[PDB]
Ligand binder design. Structure first.
Ligand SMILES: N[C@@H](CCC(=O)N[C@@H](CS)C(=O)NCC(=O)O)C(=O)O
Ligand SMILES: N[C@@H](CCC(=O)N[C@@H](CS)C(=O)NCC(=O)O)C(=O)O
Ligand SMILES: CC/C=C\C[C@H]1C(=O)CC[C@@H]1CC(=O)O
Ligand SMILES: CC[C@H](C)[C@H](N)C(=O)O
Ligand SMILES: [Mg+2]
Lengths: 569, 214, 214
């Protein structure tokens, strides 16, 4: 149960317990996971008076390629305990690409334990700095709307799907966050873009009591706000007569919204009078919820260009930055949320796992052994290696962080990265120029409708016979079935190589399936990626996904606004 | 060659069998007529008259846990069941004893009873199921880096997961894909490949046990 | 220093105490109001909330036979309760397992209940003390040539003998003498000489719970 003062004092106690907690964390991790096969290769049985030393002296640092076969084994019909243990409920994918190939990583309920405690922790620190009403709400542009089963029959996916569909999410987050504006259905609605507009709407419907605006990214907020600048005429009209726009066509959400709709003339007059005042949207974020005392986002790294427009969006509202870490292994919590975006430093939490940092100080790159958490010298930049329950043991994620200070007994971490740049020939191609090419040429059909395609990803299914490649699209707006059917056909027509033709024209692999998804899905992808515990080098996102990709994988399915195989063929 | 006093449906005997096979020994499997128990059985464990009972060199080892431990110690040269540390052996022991006490009784309720014991039995099944899953953290096996003592103790129950699946009117997998699936991974090794009798056979005779007494 | 969560009339706790004192370890004992179980104890076993519990190096050790096995494994250089052979270990384990089945239940039935339940329990315990008599045959101690695993396991039941003798108004000595005889024989070990509280009091505990449930 939530409290700020005790929770902060146990944090002061824990952070001060940084070495003790990191090592004990190792102990529970090894003891819980003694049976792992890599470990048998490694020669480890637990206990001993050199558990940490044995830890760093017996098993080599793993890479995604080496990880991929076993994890592949956990997902493709052989429910198999591997580099972690018990068959994981869901699986993850990290930024960059494993040889350009997709990457698969383990998930467990511990991700929820850590997630819950971290948000409780952070909300306590933030509300400490930024107090909120007990009876208010939070504008959360959050989404976890897609559920599907991988080929093996084991669910595979995103941190968000699992975090909001987890039985514990509603109960766990009810006390420590302000009541969500959006009905859980709209959040889990089969149409995310329609859900973004609706989310804007829901978010916009009780603002008098809003404590803050939420998106995990400054650019996320940027999307919601530019989109805000992309639909309020329609918004006022939809809400005005009490009849929602023809733009949204999914029944669960439509029925849900119509439950809360009636004709009200005046509000239009009001909304209309104020938003005109903005000189072109200067700091409208405070204006729409006049009482939020902050803007919650991740505004560093790949987002540094985006904070000013968010500031441009936020106006004079303070910018608070999100804690760092993922289900892959959480890392740090922002003890000092009120800090400026250009100086945001986040405090590592000790039991999330056991991490080590690989230095860069020789030239580029150099050869120094990984050293202890506080052993890391101030001011220099170290890449991050982590051992946790996330199934990832001693793995090189290849991204650099800089330590600038210490909170109590723990270090403070800052990031300046962009992309985790080590790339090798990818197999989920269809040369990326061609994948991008396909999206570009086909999307022109969607470009006739005053909307430009935003982002995309592709998939390969070995379950179906013949297997069908699945391409997904993030876009500016809603359109009917015919055009997207033409778009699928066009993607098919687009990969110009002699091979794709030999196959598909032959029949050995099925008609390319265009499962047009909804907007923000890639945005979610970005949002979980930059946030992962490592360093800011986490945004060169994967184009095509094979059996081994996962984070785009829960996202692809339930919210397929349109799922169609080529009319051609 | 070692003589295994075993029963076709008995889980624990299945543990014995999976253990000897997993390690790397060639032994003889003996089925039994409880109606007409063999002279060897009656001499080997007269009071209990229960299986498993392995006669090795002329020395009979009853009990599945006792027999798996025995397979381990008489022949501990390649695929060791227990971890080297005493506390580790301890964890395997505590957990194996665990599948064998509360879990066993409850599943016993899930296939052999009616009325309230059935409903109670299913509930205890889930509550128990999460706990074993809960201690697991995320461990591929239980006893050692590969096949283990606790692992040996609970694997035979993999056969019974299908029975619980329909008879218990429950899904051990939808709520806990983890355990049954763990068993599926454990079904790639030859030991469980041939040790555990067909899932369908176990379920049908189980229903039959229900038919024979009221 | 090792710490033990113990109950004054706990044969189980006594299993632990006899074992630890037996090897050669200085330790601490803490009595438990089971009505209010200890934070260290609840931490040891959150669900069972059952003793005896030995804590070493920060790890709670649970279950009686497990605790004694823990005793042998904890300091493997001076006093072993087990014989060198694997089969011997198996015989001892088999017998200790015998100690925990119809035997615990049997005494539990005689001191525990009355009437219809009582006689069933009476014949069960006499029969059990008798089979025990048969396996004992001659040995000073069953666990092996010297004080062993099982010795610690079932010697502890002897203090309750007074209770069983009076409640069922029996005299287990005439039908099976060597058991009780050997029991006070084992009383000589410094392991059980101090760990186990007096019989009149245990019997008294038996008087008190019997007083409540009538
Ligand atoms: N806890 C014992 C169980 C022994 C047991 O109860 N066996 C049962 C069936 S597996 C038996 O032999 N019943 C005799 C009968 O059915 O007549 C073990 O670990 O083996
Ligand atoms: N198998 C356990 C059983 C021990 C046992 O029965 N302990 C009793 C002491 S009389 C107990 O803790 N009862 C507590 C309760 O009923 O919750 C062992 O031998 O350690
Ligand atoms: C601990 C909560 C789990 C996810 C929290 C996420 C949000 O929804 C805001 C930030 C955070 C993204 C990140 O910290 O990596
Ligand atoms: C709450 C979910 C967070 C943002 C996670 N990193 C995700 O984006 O899936
Ligand atoms: Mg995401």
């Amino acid at each position: 149960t939530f409290d700020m003062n005790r929770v902060i004092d146990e944090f002061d106690e824990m952070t001060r317990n940084a070495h003790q907690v990191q090592k004990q964390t190792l102990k529970e991790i090894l003891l819980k996971n003694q049976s792992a096969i890599y470990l048998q290769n490694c020669g480890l049985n637990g206990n001993a008076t050199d558990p940490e030393e044995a830890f760093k002296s017996m098993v080599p640092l793993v890479t995604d390629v080496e990880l991929e076969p076993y994890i592949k084994r956990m997902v493709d019909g052989d429910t198999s305990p591997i580099l972690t243990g018990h068959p994981v409920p869901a699986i993850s994918l990290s930024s960059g690409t494993s040889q350009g190939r997709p990457k698969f990583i383990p998930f467990t309920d511990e991700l929820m334990e850590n997630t819950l405690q971290l948000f409780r922790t952070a909300f306590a620190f933030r509300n400490r700095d930024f107090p909120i009403d007990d009876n208010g709400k939070a504008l959360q542009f959050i989404f976890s709307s897609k559920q599907y089963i991988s080929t093996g029959g084991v669910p595979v996916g995103t941190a968000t799907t699992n975090v909001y569909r987890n039985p514990n999410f509603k109960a766990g987050m009810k006390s420590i966050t302000s009541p969500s504006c959006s009905p859980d259905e709209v959040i889990f609605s089969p149409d995310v873009h329609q859900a973004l507009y609706c989310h804007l709407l829901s978010g916009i419907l009780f603002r008098d009591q809003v404590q803050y605006v939420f998106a995990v990214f400054a650019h996320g907020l940027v999307h919601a706000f530019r989109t805000f600048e992309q639909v309020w005429e329609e918004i006022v009209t939809d809400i005005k007569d009490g009849v929602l726009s023809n733009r949204i066509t999914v029944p669960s959400v439509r029925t849900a919204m119509s439950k809360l709709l009636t004709p009200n003339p005046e509000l239009a007059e009001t909304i209309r009078t104020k938003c005109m005042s903005l000189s072109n949207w200067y700091g409208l974020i405070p204006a729409l919820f006049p009482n939020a005392k902050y803007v919650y986002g991740i505004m560093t790294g790949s987002m540094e260009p985006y904070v000013p427009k968010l500031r441009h969006y936020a106006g004079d509202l303070p910018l608070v930055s999100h804690d760092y870490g993922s289900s892959e292994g959480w890392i740090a919590a922002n003890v000092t949320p009120r800090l400026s975006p250009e100086e945001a430093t986040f405090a590592v939490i000790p039991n999330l796992g056991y991490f080590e940092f690989l230095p860069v100080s020789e030239t580029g790159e150099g050869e120094e052994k990984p050293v202890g958490l506080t052993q890391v010298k101030i001011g220099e930049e170290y890449e991050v290696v982590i051992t946790n329950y996330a199934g990832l043991y001693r793995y090189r994620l290849g991204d650099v962080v800089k330590v600038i200070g210490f909170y109590n007994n723990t270090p403070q971490l800052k990031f300046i990265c962009r992309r985790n740049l080590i790339l090798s020939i990818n197999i989920d191609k269809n040369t990326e120029r061609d994948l991008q090419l396909s999206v570009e040429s086909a999307a022109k059909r969607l470009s006739e409708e005053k909307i430009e395609v935003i982002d995309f990803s592709s998939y390969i299914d070995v379950s179906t016979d013949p297997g069908h490649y699945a391409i997904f699209w993030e876009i500016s707006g809603e359109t009917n079935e015919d055009v997207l059917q033409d778009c699928c056909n066009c993607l098919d027509r687009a990969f110009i190589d002699a091979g794709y033709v030999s196959s598909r024209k032959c029949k050995t692999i099925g008609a390319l399936e265009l499962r047009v998804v909804a907007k923000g899905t890639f945005r979610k992808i970005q949002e979980h990626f930059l946030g992962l515990g490592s360093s800011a080098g986490q945004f060169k996102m994967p184009r095509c996904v094979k059996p081994s990709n996962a984070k785009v994988l829960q996202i692809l399915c339930e919210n397929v606004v349109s799922s169609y195989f080529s009319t051609a063929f | 060659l070692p003589i295994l006093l075993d029963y076709w449906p008995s889980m624990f005997g299945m543990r014995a069998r999976v253990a000897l096979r997993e390690k790397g020994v060639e032994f003889e499997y003996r089925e039994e007529d409880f109606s007409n128990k063999s002279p060897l059985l009656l001499q080997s464990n007269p009071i209990h008259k229960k299986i498993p009972v392995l006669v090795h060199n002329g020395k009979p080892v009853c009990e599945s846990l006792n027999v798996v431990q025995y397979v381990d110690e008489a022949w501990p040269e390649k695929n060791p069941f227990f971890p080297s540390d005493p506390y580790g052996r301890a964890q395997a022991r505590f957990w194996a004893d665990f599948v064998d006490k509360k879990f066993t009784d409850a599943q016993f309720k899930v296939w052999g009873k009616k009325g309230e014991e059935q409903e109670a039995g299913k509930k205890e099944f889930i509550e128990a199921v999460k706990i074993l899953e809960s201690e697991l953290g995320d461990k591929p096996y239980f006893g050692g880096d590969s096949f283990g003592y606790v692992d040996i103790s609970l694997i035979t129950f993999s056969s019974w997961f299908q029975a619980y699946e329909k008879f218990g009117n429950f899904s051990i997998e939808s709520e806990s894909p983890k355990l049954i699936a763990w068993a599926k991974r454990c079904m790639e090794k030859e030991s469980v490949s041939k040790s555990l009798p067909d899932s369908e056979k176990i379920v049908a005779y189980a229903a039959e046990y229900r038919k024979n007494n009221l």
